[PDB]
Amino acid sequence: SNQLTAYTLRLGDNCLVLSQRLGEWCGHAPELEIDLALANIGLDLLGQARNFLSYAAELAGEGDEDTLAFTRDERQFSNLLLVEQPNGNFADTIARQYFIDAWHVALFTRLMESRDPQLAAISAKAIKEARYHLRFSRGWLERLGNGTDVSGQKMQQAINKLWRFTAELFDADEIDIALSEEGIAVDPRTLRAAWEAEVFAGINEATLNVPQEQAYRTGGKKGLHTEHLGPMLAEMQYLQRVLPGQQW
Amino acid sequence: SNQLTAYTLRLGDNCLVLSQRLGEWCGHAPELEIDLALANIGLDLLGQARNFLSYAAELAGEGDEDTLAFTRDERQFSNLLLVEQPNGNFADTIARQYFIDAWHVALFTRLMESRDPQLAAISAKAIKEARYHLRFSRGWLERLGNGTDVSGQKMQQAINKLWRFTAELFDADEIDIALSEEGIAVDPRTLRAAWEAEVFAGINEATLNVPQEQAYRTGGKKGLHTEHLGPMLAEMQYLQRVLPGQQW
Amino acid sequence: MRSTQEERFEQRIAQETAIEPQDWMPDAYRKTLIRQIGQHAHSEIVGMLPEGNWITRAPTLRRKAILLAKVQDEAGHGLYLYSAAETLGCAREDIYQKMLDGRMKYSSIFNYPTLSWADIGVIGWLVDGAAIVNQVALCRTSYGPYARAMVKICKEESFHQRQGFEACMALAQGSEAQKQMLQDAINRFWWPALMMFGPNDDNSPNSARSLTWKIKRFTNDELRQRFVDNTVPQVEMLGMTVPDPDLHFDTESGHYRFGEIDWQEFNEVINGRGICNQERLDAKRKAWEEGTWVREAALAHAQK
Amino acid sequence: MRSTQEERFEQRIAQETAIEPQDWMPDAYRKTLIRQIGQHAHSEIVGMLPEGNWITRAPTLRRKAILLAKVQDEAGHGLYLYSAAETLGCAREDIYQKMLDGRMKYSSIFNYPTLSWADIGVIGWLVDGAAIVNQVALCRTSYGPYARAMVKICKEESFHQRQGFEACMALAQGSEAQKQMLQDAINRFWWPALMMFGPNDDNSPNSARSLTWKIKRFTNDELRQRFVDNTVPQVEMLGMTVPDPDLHFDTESGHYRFGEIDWQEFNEVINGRGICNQERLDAKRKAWEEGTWVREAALAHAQK
C-alpha cells in the first residue's frame, strides 16, 4: 500500500506545486486573455491535485488533501523539480508548462488503463484537461518562438534553462517499476518516445533548437528539491501553520 | 506601561523588518564590497531590533524577542510602511535606506536624552551605527544620482516611488504625544526639520529633485500595512510556526 | 426645441425601448456609457489583484479552488464589459491605457489591502454583495448591450458571493482566533463597501442625466439603503457587529438608519490617494509594459 | 640542469623561506597559486549563497544575527584572498569573470542545497570544520601572502565554526523533530564535506608539484583522515550517526577507517553537473549583470 500511496502522492504534488506557480501570475499577465487562461490551467491542476491527494489520504487511512498539502515539509514533498521552477518571464512559464503538458498527456493517456480503478478514473478526468493545456502551451511556444527575434531568443533561452530538469520525467525508481509490473503505474522510462515526439516537433515548428545538453537533474520525487521549494511552502502553508486543526 | 511598550515595539519592528529586506540582498549585490556593506547594516539593524524587542518584552512582563518577532501577525506588527517596501533595484534599496538612516540619526540623537534610561541607552548604541549607515546610503545616493544618465534616472525614480511613505516618519499619535510630554519619547513631528535638512541637501548634492507629491501614506504603526508585509512574515516565521516553543 | 432626433430618443427612453449600438443617441449619452461601462470593466481587472494576493496563501485546497474559479470569472466579466463598451465606438486598448494613466477610474473598493484570509471571504460576501445590488439594478439599464452583459454577469457572480459568505460562516463558527479575524476584516471593509454605491444624491454630478436617460434606475442612496437593509441580517447571522455606532432600525420607516460616510476618505481614494492606488496601478502598468514583447510576438506570428 | 634561478628557488623552498611577491618563481608555481588562491576566493563568494538562502528564515534572532555576522566575514575573506591572488600579477576582475564563465572552479560543497535550518548549522560545523583543517594546514604554505591570509582567515572562521556546532547542539538536545532534522542534514552533507579535501593521493594531478614546492603541506588523504578522526567524536557528542556502514575505529593504526567516496559524483560536481551548480552560477551571473549600471555609475562619479 505504501508504494501506491507514494506514487499517487507524486502525481498530486506535481499538480499542486505547478498550480501554486500559476496562481502567482493572477493579474500580472501580458493580456487579460492570458490571465484567464493561466487561472483556468491552475484551477484544473489544483482539481487534479485534490483528486490524487484525496486518494493518497484514503490509501494511507488517515489525513486528507489539506493535511497532505499543508503539514508536510520540503523533504516530504515529492513533486518534479520542473514544477517548482520560478515563473520567470512569460517564455519561462510557457516552456515549463509545455514540458509538463506533453508529459501529462502521454502519462494520463496510459494511466487511464491502470489496473487501479481510482487512478484510472482520476486520469480519465485529468487527460481531458491536459489536452486543453497542451494546446495553449504549444500554441504559445509557436507564437513566441516564431514571433519576433526578441521573442524567439527568449523562448530558446527558456527552453535551454529548463532542459536539465526533463530527465526526471523519465526517471524510474523501484516504486515506479514495482507498480508498473503490477499494471498499476506507468513506467516513466516508456514515456520518452511520446514526450520527445511531441516536444521535438513543437520546438522545431516554433523554429527553435532542441538543447544538446544531456538532462541530468532529478531528486524531487525523493524529497530532494531545489532551493525554490522551501520558500514556496512557507508562503503556501503559513496560515495553516499559524492556526492548525481548523475548518475553513 | 502599554504606551511605552508599544512605542519601543515600533522602533524594534522598524529595525527588524528593514533587516529582513537587507538579508535578501546577500550574495546578490553589484559588488562584493556592497554585499559586505549590506550584511553589516542588516546585522546592525537586527541587533537594534533585538535590543528594543527585548525591552518591550521586559516592559510587558512576558515573552522575549523571539515570541515578539515570530508569533505576532501582520495586524500586530508596527513597523513603518517604508521599511517593508520591496528591495527592487539597487537605487530602490538605497533610497529606502537613505530615508531611514537620516531619520534614525535625527531620532536616536534625541532619544538618547530620553527620561527612560533603557531607551536612552539603546539609542546611544544605535546612533553610532546609524551614522555609519547614513554615510553609506548618502554616499551611494550621490554616486548613483551624479553618476551616469542611466543611474541618475534610476535614483530619481527610486526617490519618487518611495516618497509617499515619508509622511509616516513625522506622524504623531497619542502614544507618541503622551510619552513625548513625559520626556520619554520623541515627538516625530519635531524630527521633520532635521530630516529635511539632511535629505533635501543630499538629493540636491546628488543632482536630483525633491519630489513635489505631498506624502500621504501612513498606517504601519497601527498594524495597517501594505500587502508586502504578509508574505515577508510568512517567510520569516515559517520554521517557528511549524515547530513552536523550541530552543535553537 | 429638441431636434427630432433628440425628441425621438427621449420617447424611446420613456417607453423602455432598449437602445442598441446602431440607434442614434445623444453624444453625452454615448460618452457617459463609455465612461461607465469602461470603468466597470476596469474594475473587474483591477479587482483581480486584492484577491489574487491571497491565491497562493488560501488555507485549504477547496477555498483556493473556489478563489481561482472566482478570479477567472472576473477576468471573463472584464472581457464582456469591454465588448459591450466597444459597441459604443471606443477601443478597449485606448480606454485601458487611460486607466493605466489615471485618466479613467476603477472601483474605489479595490484600493484596499487584503491583510488576512478573512478579507477574502469578506470581499466575496460584502464587496461582491454590494456589486450585485448595483449590478442587478442595472439589468434594466437603457442600453441593451450593457443590460444583457449585466444579466450574464449577475448569474455568475451571485454564486461566488454565496461562496464568500460560506467562507465567512466557517470563520464565524470556528475558533476564537477565526472569529476575531472575521470581525477585523468586517471592521476594515464595511464602510469601503458602502462607498461602492457612489456619492450622496446631493453630490452626484452624473445622476441627473443618468436617471433621466434610464442608465441608472435607482439612486446611489437608494441602492446603498437596500444594501444596508439586506446585509445587516447577514452580519447578524454570522454573530458579528457593524463598526457603526449610529446604526439602528427605524420602525417608523422600515429601514436601517446608518451613520455618515467619510466623504473626505472617499474623495482621496477615487483621486488616487487611497491605501493601494499606487500599487494597483503599478502592478497593472508593470504587467502591461513587461508583456509588450509577448503581445508584439503574437501580432508578428499571426501575420505569417 | 636547472637554471641558477630555478636552483635558488628550490633551495629557498627547502629552507622554509617564504616566497614574496617580488621574488622569482617558476611560472608554473605562479600559475598554480593564481589557480588555487583565486578559486579559494571564488569559494568564499559562492558559499555566501547556500547560507544566505536561510538568512531570512533563521528560527531565532540570535541565530539570524550569528549567520549574518558569519556571511559578512565570508565576504571579507573573499576580499583578502583576491588581494593575495593579485600579488601574483592577476586581476580580480579577470579571474572573477572566469569563475562566472565556468573557466575556474569554486569549492564542490557549495553546489549542495540548504533544505532545512539544520543544514545551516551543519555547514557551520562540518563544512567550515573541513575548510578549517585544510586552511590551518595552509598557514605554512610557501607563498607569504597566502600563508598570512590563511592565518587571518583561520582566526575568524574557527569562531563561526564553534557557533555552527552550538546551533547543532541545540537541535541535538531539542525535540525529536529537531534531532531528526539534524540527522538528515548530516546524512546529506557528510560525504560532500569529505570531498572538500580533494581527490585521492593516487588521482591528484596538482599534488606532485604542490607538495614539492610546499604549497600543499599535507596530502588530500592526510587532511581528510585528520578531519574524520577529529570529527567523529563531535558527531558522537551530538548523539548522531555517520551515514557510513564502513566507518570503524582501527586500534592497530589509531585511525578511523572510513568508506569509499563516490568519485563519480565528485567528478560530476566539479564539472558543473551537481545539484546547484547552474543555480549558483546563475545567481552570481545575474548579480554581476544587473549590477553593471551601479559599477558604471561608481566609475563615472569618481572621475568628476
Ligand SMILES: CC(C)(COP(=O)(O)OP(=O)(O)OC[C@H]1O[C@@H](n2cnc3c(N)ncnc32)[C@H](O)[C@@H]1OP(=O)(O)O)[C@@H](O)C(=O)NCCC(=O)NCCS
Ligand atoms: C458608481 C455608480 C454606481 C454611480 O456613479 P455615477 O453616476 O457614474 O457617478 P457619480 O456622479 O455618482 O459620482 C461622481 C464621480 O465619482 C465616481 N465614483 C462614484 N463612485 C465610485 C466608486 N465607488 N469608485 C470609483 N469611482 C466612483 C464616478 O464614476 C464619477 O466620476 P467620473 O465622472 O470621472 O466617472 C455607477 O458608475 C455604476 O453603477 N457603475 C457600474 C458599477 C461598477 O463600476 N462596479 C464596479 C464593481 S465590480
Ligand SMILES: CC(C)(COP(=O)(O)OP(=O)(O)OC[C@H]1O[C@@H](n2cnc3c(N)ncnc32)[C@H](O)[C@@H]1OP(=O)(O)O)[C@@H](O)C(=O)NCCC(=O)NCCS
Ligand atoms: C582542493 C585542494 C585541497 C587540493 O586540490 P589541488 O592540489 O589544487 O588539485 P587536485 O590535483 O588535488 O584536484 C584535481 C582538480 O579538482 C579540483 N578540486 C579538488 N577538490 C575540489 C573541490 N572540493 N571542489 C572543487 N574543486 C576541487 C582541483 O582544483 C583540480 O582542478 P584544477 O586544476 O582546475 O584547479 C586545494 O586546491 C586547496 O587546498 N585549496 C584551497 C582551499 C579552498 O579552495 N577552500 C574552499 C573552502 S572555503
